[PDB]
Amino acid sequence: QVGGVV
C-alpha cells in the first residue's frame, strides 16, 4: 500500500 502525493 502506497501513500498518495500532494
Side-chain angles (χ1 to χ4, degrees):
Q1 299 178 16
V2 182
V5 295
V6 302

